[PDB]
Design a protein around this ligand. Structure first.
Ligand code: A1AM7
Ligand code: ZN
Length: 140
């Protein structure tokens, strides 16, 4: 589990979105595993605006933050998980690291702020859904 709290937006994995999230929907994309909903209180996170390929992510299944190198956001084939079939996922970044299904929502951050959230795992890789292209998260 995990979210990004930027302004009056809550960014979650689409597959973990709650009824309250869908009842307050701003934007969702199944191909990216992302959903954004509205919040009453302002959030403590800043979104990275950059093309960094090094950062640190939080891994709940280890209680640890790991420094990683990661690929630029791509369209990637993902094998079946407990929450999705084998499919193509867009705006995905891969690193070598530990990721189980419950690690989804862990933040990846660089020197500029929050890059994305854990979205995929297995075979010794961790995939992150990028949010740095979502410039509208910073305004209105
Ligand atoms: O801090 C750690 C590290 C590894 N396993 C457990 N704990 C306790 C709280 O979950
Ligand atoms: Zn950066």
């Amino acid at each position: 589990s995990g979210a990004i709290y930027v302004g009056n937006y809550r960014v979650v994995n689409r597959h973990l979105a709650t009824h309250n999230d869908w009842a307050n929907l701003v934007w969702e994309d199944s191909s990216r595993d992302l959903l954004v909903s509205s919040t009453t209180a302002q959030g403590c996170d800043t979104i990275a605006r950059c093309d960094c390929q090094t950062g640190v992510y939080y891994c709940s299944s280890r209680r640890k933050h790991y420094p990683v190198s990661f690929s630029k956001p791509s369209l990637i084939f993902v094998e079946a998980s407990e929450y999705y079939p084998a499919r193509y996922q867009s705006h995905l970044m891969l690193a070598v690291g530990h990721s189980e299904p419950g690690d989804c929502g862990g933040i990846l951050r660089c020197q500029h702020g929050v890059v994305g959230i854990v979205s995929t795992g297995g075979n010794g890789l961790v995939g992150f859904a990028d949010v740095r292209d979502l410039l509208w998260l910073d305004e209105e």
